[PDB]
Every structure is written in C-alpha cells, then in structure tokens.
C-alpha cells in the first residue's frame, strides 16, 4: 500500500509529461518526484520489497520516469535531473539483478534502452557508473532477443568510447564489467570493441592498472574482455601490432604468476588464441620464456587454467623456431 502510493506519484508525473510531449513543460521538483524515487531506490535492495514492486509494475514505472526525463531535458548538468536519473537507475539495477523476466522487460522497452545508452556521454561519472551497472545485469544471462536488442541500441561501442574518458575507479569497474559480459555474447560484439579507435591500447593498459584500493577488479575485467576478443585479434595482423607496441605478451606472462585465479585464467585464454597461426608472436613467446611458465600451470586443479596453459603450450611446442636446436 505504501509502495503503491509512491509508484502512483511517478506514474501520475509520467502521464503529465506525455500530455506535454503530445502537445509541444512540467518540472519534477514541483511534483515531489526525486524524494519518492529515492525511497524506492532504497526499498529495491530488499528481496521481499522487490517482489512487491514486480506485482505492482514497479520496473515499468521507474524505467519510464528515467526514459521521459532523458527525452525532455537531454544531457543536462542540472542536479535535480541527474540525481533523479541516478536513483532511478540504481533501482533498475537491483530489479534486474537475478530476474530473467525483468531483464527481458527492460530490454523490450526500446525507448528506455536508447535513453540509457545516451547517458554514458554525460559529465557526471557517477551517472556513468549507474548506467553501466544496469547494462551489466542486462548483459548477464541475456535471452536471444535481449542480446539482439543490446547490439541494436549500440551499448558496446558506447561503453568502450565511455571507458577511455573515465577517471574514477568505481565508474571504470562497472563499464568494464558490462563490456566483459557483452563481449561473450557473439563474434560481432567482439568486433565492435576492437573497431573503436584506441580501444585495444586501453585494454592492454588495464593489465598493469595501479589500483587505489587493494583490489584486482580492473585487471580481471580488462583482461577478461581481452580474453574474449583475442580470437578475433588472432586472425588479424593490425590488431596484433597494437598489442606488441604496448607490450601485451610480456605482460600476460607476468599475469601467470598472479595469485588471482581469474587473472591466470584470463591470461591462459588470451595466450591460447594469440599463440596460433602467427610465427612472429610464437618466436616472441619462446624468447620471453612462455614454455617454462606454461609448463608449471598444466597440472593445475582448475579446468580452464589447465586447458588454456596446455593448449597454448601445444601451439608453441608444435612450432619451434629455427634458432632453437
């Protein structure tokens, strides 16, 4: 009953906005919207409260509030507009978390999806962090239609272009988290990442990222994106050259020593694809001491570390240089 009261205020304002849109300007501060959505943002963390929202159509009301405000004011620097979009996006993130129906519902609302992707160019990096968090959950365990819609709206190129100009670590985590999920969907999603100018140079840079807090989130995310797209880079000489001049192969060998099992797994997966069909990078891996380091990881307890290290070793051992023996 109390949540119904809050959701009705949003829907009442949404209808007031659509009445103006058909004619042509209602402001959100006058109707007391940002306080109402701020309560729903906080209520969306609890699981029992999320079930109450889903029955009363809470995801649809909050999404349309975010949609209509983006269409009206655009990419404004107004505090009340941005703060409203932040609290709305934070609620949608929680509603999309662990709910296949809600992921499909927000994806199917194509007006809102276009409105979401446009906010990545905003000056507020807090807003970029909130938008990237929504796209992370939508990209995770996406159905066929949801995968196709995320590609249609152009979230892959928007997030990668955004990631270059990001300053804060919290924003950069959420953006790279979404791109890692998006890269795993299909081959065309991987091409869109590599197609962005200076994107591969950035992803190599994240391997040696100097973190503020004691966490390996940015290295795992950036290297995790690199692992997925390396299959396309393996069949491309131009992209390989970008990795050489930024020292990628030499860095990925250092990642084998890491205590983080994700970083080692990402490195072995990247070295699997890059080791095949290229005599130049093959000979480089022999010189840097890849055979010794990869031979240590063949007897690992985990599946992907053991599979990736053994497979990359197979490619190097099969194609020995003339210099050796």
């Amino acid at each position: 009953h109390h949540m119904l009261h809050l959701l009705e205020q949003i829907r009442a304002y949404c209808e007031t906005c659509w009445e103006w849109q058909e004619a042509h300007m209602p402001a959100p501060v006058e109707h007391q919207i940002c306080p109402a959505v701020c309560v729903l943002m906080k209520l969306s963390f609890d699981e029992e409260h999320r079930h109450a929202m889903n029955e009363l159509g809470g995801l649809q009301a909050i999404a349309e509030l975010l949609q209509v405000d983006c269409e009206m004011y655009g990419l404004t620097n107004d505090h009340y507009s941005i703060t409203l979009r932040r609290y709305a996006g934070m609620a949608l993130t929680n509603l999309t978390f662990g709910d296949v129906a809600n992921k499909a519902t927000l994806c199917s609302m194509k007006g809102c999806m276009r409105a979401l992707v446009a906010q990545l160019k905003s000056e507020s990096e807090d807003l970029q962090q909130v938008i990237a968090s929504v796209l992370r959950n939508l990209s995770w365990r996406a159905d066929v239609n949801s995968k196709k819609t995320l590609r249609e709206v152009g979230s892959v190129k928007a997030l990668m272009e955004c990631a270059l100009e990001v300053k804060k670590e919290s924003t950069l985590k959420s953006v790279l988290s979404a791109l890692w999920n998006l890269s795993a969907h299909c081959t065309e999603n991987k091409a869109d990442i590599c197609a962005v100018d200076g994107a591969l140079a950035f992803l190599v840079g994240t391997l040696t990222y100097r973190s503020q807090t004691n966490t390996l989130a940015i290295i795992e995310s950036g290297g995790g994106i690199l692992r997925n797209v390396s299959s396309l880079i393996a069949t491309n000489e131009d992209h390989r050259q970008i990795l050489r001049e930024n020292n990628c192969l030499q860095t990925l060998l250092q990642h084998l020593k890491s205590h983080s099992l994700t970083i080692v797994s990402n490195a072995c997966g990247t070295l699997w694809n890059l080791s095949a069909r290229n005599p130049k990078d093959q000979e480089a891996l022999w010189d840097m001491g890849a055979v010794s380091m990869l031979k240590n990881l063949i007897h690992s307890k985990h599946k992907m570390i053991a599979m990736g290290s053994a497979a990359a070793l197979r490619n190097l051992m099969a194609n020995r240089p003339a210099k050796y023996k």
Partner: peptide, 8 residues
C-alpha cells in the same frame, strides 16, 4: 563479470 546489486 557476472551480475550484481548496485555498487554503493
């Protein structure tokens, strides 16, 4: 990367 609630 997985899924997550909002990084507060």
């Amino acid at each position: 990367a997985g899924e997550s609630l909002y990084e507060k």
